[PDB]
Amino acid sequence: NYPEEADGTLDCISMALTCTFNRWGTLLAVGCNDGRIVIWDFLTRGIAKIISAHIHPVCSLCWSRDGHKLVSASTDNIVSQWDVLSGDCDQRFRFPSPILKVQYHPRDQNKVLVCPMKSAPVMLTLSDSKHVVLPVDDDSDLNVVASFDRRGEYIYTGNAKGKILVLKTDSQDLVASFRVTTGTSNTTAIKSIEFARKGSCFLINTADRIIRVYDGREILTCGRDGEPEPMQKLQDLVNRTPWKKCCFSGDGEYIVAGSARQHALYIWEKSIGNLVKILHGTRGELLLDVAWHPVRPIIASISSGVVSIWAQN
Amino acid sequence: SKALLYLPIPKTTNIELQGVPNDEVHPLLGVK
């Protein structure tokens, strides 16, 4: 199902900024603004390990497929791999601009996708510490966000002019592309691309405050410069809410989106597009992140330095 | 293979990217 009630907080002195569940949902890693990574035993809501990862705030985290490694990024352009069991730093990279996102290839944890600001995305290979700059469309200087699809067989990128590129992960061949445009046919920047843990659907969050949901299988069949039609367009027509972060439920049947203006989580049923629930946090606080548990109807959100948990309890 | 589920309680590489500006600010922290 989906959560429906506030169900406590994860109390830490470190100020939470971003969080992510491991594959099984047994651990929640929380990156904090003192540069620490706090790893919670999520089944008992107790702290399992604290890693002193960076000097400056942690802004992105991703667990490896086997659960043994975490990759982190700092707001002053560092990307590091951590061995979770030892807490040791395996290796460290320095980029020229701040890091918007890091993500392991979901089926090859030797590979890390990095999205620096005002740059093409970059693929790191950890075994030899080499990097490859991915291709871009339109202009070389736009902000570009990117995500592996569920199997990591493709990389989807989206730029500040609404251009979506679909690249084969191994060869970087451009297999499909399209441009998101508004009703006014102006361009709208891609803010994030998020994939479901099951199936083939993904969503795009854009600056026009509409969450567009597509089936990746349809995207591939439309090819280059296609005009695929979204399966759903999710938005608040009354408040014109911009979205900070969006996530699929673990079975891909629901979508949660956190408002960038109020402390509110909107939950839609994915196939029908109906709004099922809005969860309201403490008034006045700003949401920074949201994560849906991979197995259960439990959502974690971050505001005012605290992880809030929402459950059907 | 084998997986870490329960948690019972360095070499640096500089990546140089042509044309990427050096005065950007992370969106969490402000704007340039």
CSV table of C-alpha atoms in Angstrom, one decimal:
chain,number,residue,atom,x,y,z
A,1,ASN,CA,0.0,0.0,0.0
A,2,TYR,CA,1.2,3.5,1.0
A,3,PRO,CA,1.9,5.2,4.3
A,4,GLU,CA,-0.8,7.4,5.8
A,5,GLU,CA,0.4,8.7,9.2
A,6,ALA,CA,3.5,10.3,10.7
A,7,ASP,CA,5.4,7.6,12.7
A,8,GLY,CA,8.3,9.1,14.5
A,9,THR,CA,11.7,10.5,13.6
A,10,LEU,CA,15.2,9.2,13.4
A,11,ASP,CA,16.9,11.3,16.2
A,12,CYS,CA,20.4,12.2,15.4
A,13,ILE,CA,22.5,15.3,16.4
A,14,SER,CA,23.9,15.4,12.8
A,15,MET,CA,21.7,17.5,10.5
A,16,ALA,CA,20.2,15.3,7.8
A,17,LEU,CA,20.3,16.4,4.1
A,18,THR,CA,19.9,13.3,2.0
A,19,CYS,CA,19.1,9.6,2.5
A,20,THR,CA,18.9,6.3,0.7
A,21,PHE,CA,17.9,2.7,1.4
A,22,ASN,CA,20.0,-0.3,0.6
A,23,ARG,CA,18.4,-2.8,-1.8
A,24,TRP,CA,16.7,-4.8,1.0
A,25,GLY,CA,15.5,-1.8,3.0
A,26,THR,CA,17.4,-3.0,6.1
A,27,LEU,CA,19.7,0.0,6.3
A,28,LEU,CA,19.1,3.7,5.7
A,29,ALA,CA,22.2,5.9,5.0
A,30,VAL,CA,21.8,9.5,5.9
A,31,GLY,CA,24.2,12.2,4.6
A,32,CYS,CA,24.5,15.1,7.0
A,33,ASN,CA,25.7,18.7,6.8
A,34,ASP,CA,28.6,18.1,9.2
A,35,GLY,CA,30.0,15.7,6.5
A,36,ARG,CA,29.0,12.6,8.4
A,37,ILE,CA,27.2,9.6,7.0
A,38,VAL,CA,24.8,8.1,9.6
A,39,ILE,CA,23.8,4.5,8.8
A,40,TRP,CA,20.6,3.4,10.6
A,41,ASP,CA,19.5,-0.1,11.3
A,42,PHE,CA,16.1,0.6,9.8
A,43,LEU,CA,14.3,-2.4,11.3
A,44,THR,CA,14.9,-1.2,14.9
A,45,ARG,CA,15.6,2.5,14.2
A,46,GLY,CA,19.0,2.5,15.9
A,47,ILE,CA,22.2,3.9,14.6
A,48,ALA,CA,24.5,1.1,13.3
A,49,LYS,CA,27.5,3.1,12.2
A,50,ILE,CA,28.7,6.7,11.7
A,51,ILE,CA,31.3,7.5,9.0
A,52,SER,CA,33.2,10.8,9.0
A,53,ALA,CA,33.0,11.1,5.3
A,54,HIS,CA,33.7,14.7,4.3
A,55,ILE,CA,34.6,18.1,5.7
A,56,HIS,CA,31.6,19.8,4.0
A,57,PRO,CA,27.9,18.8,3.7
A,58,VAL,CA,27.2,15.5,2.1
A,59,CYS,CA,24.8,16.0,-0.9
A,60,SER,CA,24.4,12.6,-2.6
A,61,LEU,CA,24.7,8.9,-1.6
A,62,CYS,CA,24.2,5.5,-3.3
A,63,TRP,CA,24.5,1.9,-2.1
A,64,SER,CA,26.2,-0.7,-4.1
A,65,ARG,CA,24.3,-3.7,-5.3
A,66,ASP,CA,26.0,-6.0,-2.8
A,67,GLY,CA,25.4,-3.6,0.1
A,68,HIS,CA,29.1,-3.5,1.1
A,69,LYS,CA,29.9,-0.1,-0.4
A,70,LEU,CA,28.5,3.4,-0.3
A,71,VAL,CA,29.5,6.2,-2.7
A,72,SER,CA,29.1,9.7,-1.4
A,73,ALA,CA,29.5,13.2,-2.8
A,74,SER,CA,30.2,16.5,-1.0
A,75,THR,CA,29.1,20.0,-1.8
A,76,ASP,CA,32.8,20.9,-2.4
A,77,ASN,CA,33.1,18.5,-5.3
A,78,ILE,CA,34.5,15.3,-3.8
A,79,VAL,CA,33.2,11.8,-4.6
A,80,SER,CA,34.3,9.0,-2.3
A,81,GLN,CA,33.7,5.2,-2.0
A,82,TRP,CA,33.3,3.8,1.5
A,83,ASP,CA,33.7,0.3,2.7
A,84,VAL,CA,30.6,0.0,4.9
A,85,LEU,CA,32.0,-2.8,7.2
A,86,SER,CA,35.3,-1.1,8.0
A,87,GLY,CA,34.3,2.6,7.5
A,88,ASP,CA,37.4,3.0,5.4
A,89,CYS,CA,37.6,5.2,2.3
A,90,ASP,CA,38.4,3.0,-0.7
A,91,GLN,CA,39.2,5.9,-3.0
A,92,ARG,CA,38.4,9.6,-3.6
A,93,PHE,CA,37.9,11.8,-6.7
A,94,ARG,CA,38.0,15.6,-7.0
A,95,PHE,CA,35.7,17.3,-9.6
A,96,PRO,CA,35.9,20.9,-10.9
A,97,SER,CA,32.3,21.8,-10.0
A,98,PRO,CA,29.8,20.7,-7.3
A,99,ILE,CA,28.2,17.2,-7.6
A,100,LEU,CA,24.5,17.1,-8.3
A,101,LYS,CA,24.2,13.3,-8.1
A,102,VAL,CA,26.2,10.0,-7.8
A,103,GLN,CA,24.8,6.6,-8.7
A,104,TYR,CA,26.3,3.1,-9.0
A,105,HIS,CA,25.5,1.1,-12.1
A,106,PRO,CA,22.8,-1.1,-10.5
A,107,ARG,CA,24.4,-4.2,-12.0
A,108,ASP,CA,28.1,-3.2,-12.0
A,109,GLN,CA,29.3,-1.6,-8.8
A,110,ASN,CA,32.7,-1.0,-10.5
A,111,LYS,CA,31.0,1.8,-12.3
A,112,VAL,CA,29.8,5.2,-10.8
A,113,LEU,CA,27.8,7.8,-12.8
A,114,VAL,CA,28.6,11.4,-11.6
A,115,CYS,CA,26.6,14.5,-12.5
A,116,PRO,CA,28.8,17.6,-11.9
A,117,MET,CA,27.2,21.1,-12.3
A,118,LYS,CA,27.5,22.8,-15.7
A,119,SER,CA,29.1,19.6,-17.2
A,120,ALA,CA,28.4,16.5,-19.2
A,121,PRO,CA,27.8,13.5,-16.9
A,122,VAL,CA,30.9,11.5,-16.1
A,123,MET,CA,31.3,7.7,-15.8
A,124,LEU,CA,34.0,6.5,-13.3
A,125,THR,CA,35.5,3.1,-13.3
A,126,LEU,CA,36.8,2.3,-9.8
A,127,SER,CA,39.2,-0.5,-10.5
A,128,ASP,CA,41.4,1.8,-12.6
A,129,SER,CA,40.2,5.2,-11.5
A,130,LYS,CA,39.6,6.3,-15.1
A,131,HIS,CA,36.7,8.4,-16.3
A,132,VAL,CA,34.7,8.9,-19.5
A,133,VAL,CA,32.8,12.1,-20.3
A,134,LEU,CA,29.3,11.2,-21.7
A,135,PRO,CA,27.8,12.9,-24.7
A,136,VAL,CA,25.5,15.9,-24.5
A,137,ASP,CA,23.0,17.6,-26.8
A,138,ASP,CA,22.2,21.3,-27.4
A,139,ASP,CA,25.2,22.9,-25.6
A,140,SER,CA,28.2,21.8,-23.7
A,141,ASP,CA,27.6,24.1,-20.7
A,142,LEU,CA,24.1,23.2,-19.5
A,143,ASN,CA,23.2,21.5,-16.2
A,144,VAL,CA,22.6,17.9,-17.0
A,145,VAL,CA,21.1,15.2,-14.7
A,146,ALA,CA,21.2,11.5,-15.5
A,147,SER,CA,20.1,8.1,-14.2
A,148,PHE,CA,20.7,4.5,-15.0
A,149,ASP,CA,17.5,2.6,-15.9
A,150,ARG,CA,16.5,-0.3,-13.6
A,151,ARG,CA,19.0,-2.8,-15.1
A,152,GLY,CA,21.7,-0.2,-15.9
A,153,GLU,CA,21.5,-1.2,-19.6
A,154,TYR,CA,20.7,2.4,-20.5
A,155,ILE,CA,21.6,5.9,-19.2
A,156,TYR,CA,18.9,8.6,-19.5
A,157,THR,CA,20.2,12.2,-19.4
A,158,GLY,CA,18.1,15.4,-19.3
A,159,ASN,CA,19.4,18.9,-19.7
A,160,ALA,CA,18.2,22.4,-18.8
A,161,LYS,CA,16.5,22.8,-22.2
A,162,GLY,CA,14.3,19.7,-21.7
A,163,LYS,CA,16.3,17.4,-23.9
A,164,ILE,CA,16.2,13.7,-22.9
A,165,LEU,CA,18.9,11.4,-24.3
A,166,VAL,CA,18.9,7.6,-24.0
A,167,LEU,CA,22.3,6.1,-24.3
A,168,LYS,CA,23.3,2.5,-24.3
A,169,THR,CA,25.5,2.1,-21.2
A,170,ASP,CA,28.3,0.1,-22.7
A,171,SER,CA,28.7,1.8,-26.1
A,172,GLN,CA,27.2,5.2,-25.4
A,173,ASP,CA,25.2,4.9,-28.6
A,174,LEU,CA,22.2,7.3,-28.7
A,175,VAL,CA,19.2,4.9,-29.1
A,176,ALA,CA,16.3,7.4,-28.4
A,177,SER,CA,15.7,11.0,-27.6
A,178,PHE,CA,13.0,13.5,-27.1
A,179,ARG,CA,12.4,17.0,-25.8
A,180,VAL,CA,9.9,17.9,-23.1
A,181,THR,CA,8.1,21.2,-23.8
A,182,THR,CA,5.3,23.1,-22.1
A,183,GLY,CA,1.9,23.9,-23.3
A,184,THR,CA,3.4,27.2,-24.5
A,185,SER,CA,5.9,25.0,-26.4
A,186,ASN,CA,8.7,26.7,-24.5
A,187,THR,CA,11.5,24.6,-23.1
A,188,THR,CA,11.4,23.4,-19.5
A,189,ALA,CA,14.5,22.2,-17.6
A,190,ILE,CA,14.8,18.6,-16.5
A,191,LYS,CA,15.3,18.6,-12.7
A,192,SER,CA,15.4,14.8,-12.1
A,193,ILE,CA,14.9,11.4,-13.6
A,194,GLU,CA,13.8,8.6,-11.4
A,195,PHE,CA,13.2,4.9,-12.2
A,196,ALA,CA,11.1,2.3,-10.5
A,197,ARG,CA,12.7,-0.7,-8.8
A,198,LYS,CA,10.4,-3.0,-10.8
A,199,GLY,CA,9.2,-2.9,-14.4
A,200,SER,CA,10.3,-0.3,-16.9
A,201,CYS,CA,8.6,3.0,-15.9
A,202,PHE,CA,10.3,6.2,-14.9
A,203,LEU,CA,9.4,9.7,-14.2
A,204,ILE,CA,10.8,13.1,-15.1
A,205,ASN,CA,10.5,16.2,-12.8
A,206,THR,CA,10.7,19.4,-14.7
A,207,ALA,CA,10.7,23.1,-14.0
A,208,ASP,CA,7.1,23.5,-15.2
A,209,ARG,CA,6.1,21.6,-12.0
A,210,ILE,CA,4.6,18.6,-13.8
A,211,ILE,CA,5.8,15.1,-13.1
A,212,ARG,CA,5.7,13.1,-16.3
A,213,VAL,CA,5.6,9.3,-16.2
A,214,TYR,CA,6.7,7.2,-19.1
A,215,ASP,CA,7.3,3.5,-20.0
A,216,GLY,CA,11.0,3.1,-21.0
A,217,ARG,CA,9.9,0.5,-23.5
A,218,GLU,CA,7.8,3.1,-25.3
A,219,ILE,CA,10.7,5.5,-25.2
A,220,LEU,CA,13.0,3.0,-27.0
A,221,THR,CA,10.4,2.3,-29.7
A,222,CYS,CA,9.9,6.1,-30.5
A,223,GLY,CA,13.6,6.4,-31.3
A,224,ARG,CA,15.6,9.5,-31.9
A,225,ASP,CA,13.8,12.9,-31.8
A,226,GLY,CA,10.6,11.0,-30.9
A,227,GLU,CA,7.4,12.5,-29.5
A,228,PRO,CA,6.4,9.9,-26.8
A,229,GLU,CA,3.3,10.7,-24.9
A,230,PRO,CA,3.5,10.6,-21.0
A,231,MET,CA,1.5,7.9,-19.3
A,232,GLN,CA,0.6,10.4,-16.6
A,233,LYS,CA,1.2,14.1,-15.8
A,234,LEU,CA,1.1,14.7,-12.1
A,235,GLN,CA,0.7,18.2,-10.7
A,236,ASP,CA,-1.2,20.4,-8.2
A,237,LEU,CA,-3.5,22.5,-10.4
A,238,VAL,CA,-4.4,24.8,-7.5
A,239,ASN,CA,-1.2,25.5,-5.7
A,240,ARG,CA,1.2,25.0,-8.6
A,241,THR,CA,3.5,23.2,-6.3
A,242,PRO,CA,7.1,22.7,-7.5
A,243,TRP,CA,8.6,19.3,-6.6
A,244,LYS,CA,11.9,18.9,-4.7
A,245,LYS,CA,12.2,15.1,-5.0
A,246,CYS,CA,10.1,12.2,-6.4
A,247,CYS,CA,10.3,8.5,-5.8
A,248,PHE,CA,8.5,5.3,-6.8
A,249,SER,CA,7.2,2.8,-4.3
A,250,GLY,CA,9.1,-0.5,-4.4
A,251,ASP,CA,6.6,-2.2,-6.7
A,252,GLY,CA,6.4,0.9,-9.0
A,253,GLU,CA,2.6,1.2,-8.4
A,254,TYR,CA,2.8,4.6,-6.5
A,255,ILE,CA,4.7,7.8,-6.8
A,256,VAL,CA,5.5,10.2,-3.9
A,257,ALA,CA,6.6,13.7,-4.6
A,258,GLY,CA,7.8,16.1,-1.9
A,259,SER,CA,6.8,19.8,-2.3
A,260,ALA,CA,9.6,22.3,-2.6
A,261,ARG,CA,7.4,25.0,-0.9
A,262,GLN,CA,5.4,23.3,1.8
A,263,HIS,CA,6.3,20.4,4.1
A,264,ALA,CA,4.0,18.0,2.1
A,265,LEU,CA,4.3,14.6,0.4
A,266,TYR,CA,1.8,13.9,-2.4
A,267,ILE,CA,1.2,10.3,-3.2
A,268,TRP,CA,-0.4,9.2,-6.6
A,269,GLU,CA,-1.4,5.8,-7.9
A,270,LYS,CA,0.8,5.4,-10.9
A,271,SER,CA,-1.4,3.6,-13.4
A,272,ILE,CA,-4.6,5.6,-12.8
A,273,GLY,CA,-2.9,8.9,-11.9
A,274,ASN,CA,-5.1,9.6,-8.9
A,275,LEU,CA,-3.9,11.5,-5.9
A,276,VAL,CA,-4.4,9.2,-3.0
A,277,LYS,CA,-2.9,11.0,0.0
A,278,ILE,CA,-1.2,14.1,1.1
A,279,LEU,CA,1.1,13.8,4.1
A,280,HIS,CA,1.6,17.0,6.0
A,281,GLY,CA,4.8,17.6,8.0
A,282,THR,CA,5.4,20.2,10.6
A,283,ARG,CA,4.5,23.6,9.3
A,284,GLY,CA,7.2,25.9,8.1
A,285,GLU,CA,9.9,23.4,7.4
A,286,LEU,CA,11.5,22.8,4.0
A,287,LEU,CA,11.7,19.3,2.6
A,288,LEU,CA,15.1,18.3,1.2
A,289,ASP,CA,14.7,14.6,0.3
A,290,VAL,CA,12.3,11.7,0.2
A,291,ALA,CA,12.8,7.9,-0.1
A,292,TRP,CA,10.3,5.1,-0.4
A,293,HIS,CA,11.2,1.9,1.3
A,294,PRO,CA,12.0,-0.8,-1.3
A,295,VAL,CA,9.6,-3.4,0.2
A,296,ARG,CA,7.1,-1.9,2.6
A,297,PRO,CA,4.6,1.1,2.6
A,298,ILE,CA,7.1,3.3,4.5
A,299,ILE,CA,8.4,6.7,3.4
A,300,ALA,CA,11.4,8.6,4.8
A,301,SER,CA,11.6,12.4,4.4
A,302,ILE,CA,14.1,15.0,5.5
A,303,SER,CA,13.3,18.4,6.8
A,304,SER,CA,15.0,20.7,9.4
A,305,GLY,CA,17.8,18.2,9.8
A,306,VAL,CA,15.6,15.3,10.9
A,307,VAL,CA,14.5,12.2,9.1
A,308,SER,CA,10.7,11.7,9.5
A,309,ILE,CA,9.1,8.3,9.0
A,310,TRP,CA,5.6,7.8,7.5
A,311,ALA,CA,4.0,4.4,7.9
A,312,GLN,CA,0.5,2.9,7.8
A,313,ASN,CA,0.8,2.3,11.5
B,1,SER,CA,26.6,-13.4,-4.6
B,2,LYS,CA,26.9,-12.5,-0.9
B,3,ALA,CA,25.2,-9.4,0.4
B,4,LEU,CA,25.5,-7.1,3.4
B,5,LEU,CA,22.1,-6.7,5.1
B,6,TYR,CA,22.8,-6.3,8.9
B,7,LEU,CA,25.5,-4.1,10.3
B,8,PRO,CA,26.2,-5.3,13.9
B,9,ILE,CA,27.8,-2.2,15.5
B,10,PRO,CA,43.2,7.3,0.5
B,11,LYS,CA,44.0,7.4,-3.2
B,12,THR,CA,42.8,10.7,-4.7
B,13,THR,CA,42.2,11.2,-8.4
B,14,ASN,CA,41.7,14.7,-9.8
B,15,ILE,CA,39.1,14.8,-12.6
B,16,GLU,CA,39.8,17.7,-15.0
B,17,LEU,CA,36.9,18.7,-17.3
B,18,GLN,CA,37.4,21.2,-20.1
B,19,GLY,CA,35.3,24.3,-19.9
B,20,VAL,CA,33.6,23.4,-16.6
B,21,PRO,CA,33.5,26.6,-14.4
B,22,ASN,CA,35.3,26.7,-11.0
B,23,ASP,CA,33.0,29.1,-9.2
B,24,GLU,CA,29.6,27.3,-9.1
B,25,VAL,CA,27.8,26.8,-5.8
B,26,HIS,CA,25.9,23.6,-4.9
B,27,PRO,CA,22.1,24.3,-5.0
B,28,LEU,CA,21.7,23.1,-1.4
B,29,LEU,CA,23.9,26.0,-0.3
B,30,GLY,CA,23.2,29.0,-2.6
B,31,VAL,CA,23.8,30.3,-6.1
B,32,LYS,CA,26.8,31.7,-7.9
